[PDB]
């Protein structure tokens, strides 16, 4: 019986960084959704394991906020606005899976307001949160700066903002069984372990962000996971967990890492030249991904 399912999300469900990207030579190719993101490969290893998904749209999009679910999306350079991902959806979906939040919360901003690096062009959308304010100064600023209430306005835009997705989903696909997927660990609880380069890898899993500034990341990514969770405990939605079991998949655990790093290069190329993975899940990091989402669908469809 095949299950009518949407994917949406942000580029954590497009999976940044995995080539061949889908509709290369489209407006949809500034997506940087892969062919092969955790969506394509779910839906195979739920095809061997008798489950079939008859996958109607993946809206899934890099840069993508909470709110582009129900507004148009505008890519970069002039591609063009995209369509609100909530139009993706038919009264017939019984499925709907994909990571929305992180842009809303801004954790793009948050990694250039720690790296000087990342505050020069780069193909990671976002600002710095105060663009003076130093890279180095940057695990201060958010716990003890200005920084510090500015995160609590953004998890307060989040809660409401997912809050309102879970109900949108709920109007337009009154059957689907809901599914919000969680973002895999970046920062391990041992930060000493950034400290080394990945075998391979001449440059550190977060570039220049400042070492003191690496808990305060994952106590912010602690924050944003317990948001998504709360808000699907709240909206009738079922929440994969993916940080509770990355625990040492991070982007530094070397050679079972899960998550590219900052400035180490991805799969994509635009002239000669590799786009680096800007902290996105990598092969393993979406096999894993992978694994867990069909993991829990199963679950749910028994």
Known sequence: DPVPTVFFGDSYTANFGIAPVTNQDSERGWCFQAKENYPAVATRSLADKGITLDVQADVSCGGALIHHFWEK????????????????????????VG??????????RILKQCSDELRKPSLLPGDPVDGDEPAAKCGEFFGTGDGKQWLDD????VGAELEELLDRIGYFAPDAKRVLVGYPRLVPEDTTKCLTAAPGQTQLPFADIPQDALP?????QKRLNDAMKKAAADGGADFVDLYAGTGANTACDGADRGIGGLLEDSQLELLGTKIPWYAHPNDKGRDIQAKQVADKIEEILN
């Open 73 to 96: 999306q505008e890519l970069p350079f002039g591609a063009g606005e995209l369509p609100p991902q909530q139009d993706a959806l038919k009264q017939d979906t019984q499925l709907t």
């Open 99 to 108: 990571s929305l939040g992180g842009n809303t919360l801004g954790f793009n």
């Open 154 to 157: 953004q998890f307060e835009r």
């Open 216 to 220: 305060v990341l994952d106590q912010i």
